[PDB]
């Protein structure tokens, strides 16, 4: 049970509190990734990462993690950059669509070989939880 006073005077904005003003002052006006005031840092980070949009850092720094995970798109990056291809990412990339009996795919398919060898897709379930409850 929560009273209406805390919710009214602490969460939602009204005429006597400054929630929205402080939120805009903290998240927009004094943000260090703002291109209207920190264009040099944005250009430096664009050279570092190779991102073609200078407003991307503002978008990344002002979004929740799960939402950033959900609408992640594999956009292209320019070649003239300092972020290059680390070797394990290349090993991850060559086995994306590789078929069986290829040497890199077979060296990269340990877990599915263990799944298909140990007959794990016909095994039973031995544990169930005792209580299942919704959030409070």
């Amino acid at each position: 049970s929560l009273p209406r006073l805390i919710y009214e005077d602490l969460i939602l904005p009204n005429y006597n509190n400054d929630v929205d003003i402080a939120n805009k002052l903290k998240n927009v006006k004094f943000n260090i990734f703002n291109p209207s005031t920190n264009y040099e840092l944005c250009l430096f980070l664009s050279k570092l990462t190779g991102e073609p949009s200078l407003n991307e850092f503002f978008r990344v720094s002002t979004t929740p993690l799960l939402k950033r995970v959900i609408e992640r798109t594999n956009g292209p990056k320019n070649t003239d950059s300092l972020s290059f291809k680390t070797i394990t990412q290349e090993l991850l990339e060559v086995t994306r669509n590789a078929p069986s009996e290829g040497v890199m795919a077979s060296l990269l398919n340990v877990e599915k070989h263990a799944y298909e060898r140990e007959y794990l897709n016909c095994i039973q379930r031995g544990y169930h939880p005792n209580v299942s409850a919704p959030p409070v």
């Binding site: 005429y15 929205d20 003003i21 939120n23 805009k24 998240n27 260090i32 720094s61 979004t63």
Partner: protein
């Protein structure tokens, strides 16, 4: 009604225009030299020019160090920041102690911002959007008890209006500078469309639709540091449920601090921001480790470090984290060479009696003079704090027998019920099995 807790009879330092202390003024009795030194320190802080100055005030227990620190904070006013701290708070289980010390250092530098609040609030009487699949702008009509007013709005605020499920007849709240949209509920003119509905019904606003207000925002530098150093990302305006993965504190790099300083230095020159340095007060400084004592030397040499005020009540004491470093006040000699030491002297009988009378006045109790002499004798015999904490049981025991006034027998009864440390030690020594 009013709550008193070991203080709040202290209103300030009680100095005149020339900086000379009065004897009994501002709730302070005696202690001329330490009050004059604290007034000089207050003037230096009000000068707003020097960074990294430090002050250590030392003396016996129950002498007035924390009272002098609170008097400094009251003399500065509520506009100047003041961060009180204990030496045991620097040990955390999420980040290193140097990060906590740097965060508490940057918590004491503030900024004053001039801002405006613009508010439209009323009944929605017309909600017409127009395009050119993508809307161009929406005309919103608002009505209050003093009249109507029409507005044009961008599609961004229209998306938040539609997200809030605003229809014709709802009382809304639109902030012009931030774009925040709040829905209050349906109006009482539409309360009879059904006999039973789930909507809450609010009356029309009595005042005008358009309101303007001048406001002043105070923000510390640690607020601007923590507003940009979120590891998970930004959060929404309204969230009663937290994020699924727990965000812990992290060691904030100096590059973010430099960029925050660059932004603040750009904003100061335009006249939007005003910079105010403040005070970092650390009581019980003898609880600090030698590593924090070393990092304090580097932190006091920065360009933006505030005025630090320390206190200690020890003698020649071994520094924690070391084995054979005997030093005064538990402070290593490297940091003492950067310090200025203010001594605190103990009190005599008449000052103890005056302090007891002053505390009895602010607690709204009436004491007989013969009881006051007994309380002063008890304060000199055992402790000033023991005499101060025995006033409320005396008041309760006087109120028990329907009296508004303290008698000597109440003092004797309260002395019989409650003991000090010395009599407890005497019972402890001449005992058989664990008291």
């Amino acid at each position: 009604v009013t709550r008193t807790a070991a203080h709040t009879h202290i209103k300030g330092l009680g100095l005149d225009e020339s900086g000379v202390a009065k004897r009994v003024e501002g709730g302070f009795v005696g202690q001329i030299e330490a009050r004059e030194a604290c007034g000089v320190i207050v003037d230096l802080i009000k000068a707003k020019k020097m960074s990294g100055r430090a002050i250590l005030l030392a003396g016996g227990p129950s002498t007035g160090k924390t009272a002098l620190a609170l008097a400094i904070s009251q003399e500065l006013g509520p506009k100047v920041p003041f961060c009180p701290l204990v030496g045991s708070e620097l040990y955390s289980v999420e980040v290193k102690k140097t990060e906590t010390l740097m965060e508490n250092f940057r918590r004491a530098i503030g900024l004053r911002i001039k801002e405006t609040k613009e508010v439209y609030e009323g009944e929605v009487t017309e909600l017409t959007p127009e395009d050119a699949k993508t809307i161009s702008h929406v005309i919103v009509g608002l009505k209050s008890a003093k009249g109507t007013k029409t507005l044009r709005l961008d599609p961004t605020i229209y998306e938040s209006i539609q997200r809030e499920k605003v229809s014709i007849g709802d009382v809304i709240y639109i902030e012009a500078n931030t774009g925040a949209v709040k829905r209050v509920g349906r109006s009482d003119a539409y309360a009879t469309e059904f006999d039973l509905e789930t909507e809450e019904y609010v009356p029309l606003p009595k005042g005008e639709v358009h309101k303007k207000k001048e406001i002043v925002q105070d923000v510390t530098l640690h607020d601007l540091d923590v507003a940009n150093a979120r590891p998970q990302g930004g959060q929404d305006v309204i969230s009663m449920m937290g994020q699924l993965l727990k965000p812990k504190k992290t060691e904030i790099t100096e590059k973010l601090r430099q960029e925050v300083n660059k932004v603040v230095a750009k904003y100061i020159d335009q006249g939007v921001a005003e910079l105010i340095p403040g005070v970092l007060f650390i009581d019980e400084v003898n609880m600090l480790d030698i590593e924090i004592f070393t990092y304090l030397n580097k932190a006091l040499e920065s360009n933006i470090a505030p005025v630090v005020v320390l206190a200690s009540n020890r003698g020649m004491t071994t520094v924690r984290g070391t084995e054979d470093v005997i030093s005064p006040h538990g402070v290593p000699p490297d940091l003492i060479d950067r310090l200025l030491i203010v001594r605190t002297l103990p009190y005599d009988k008449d000052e103890i009696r005056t302090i007891i009378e002053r505390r009895a006045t602010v607690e709204r109790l009436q004491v007989e003079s013969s009881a006051l002499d007994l309380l002063a004798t008890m304060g000199t015999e055992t402790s000033l704090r023991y005499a101060l904490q025995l006033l409320a049981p005396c008041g309760i025991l006087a109120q028990t027998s329907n009296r508004k006034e303290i008698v000597v027998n109440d003092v004797n009864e309260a002395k019989l019920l409650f003991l000090d440390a010395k009599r407890s030690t005497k019972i402890l020594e001449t005992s058989a099995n664990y008291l």
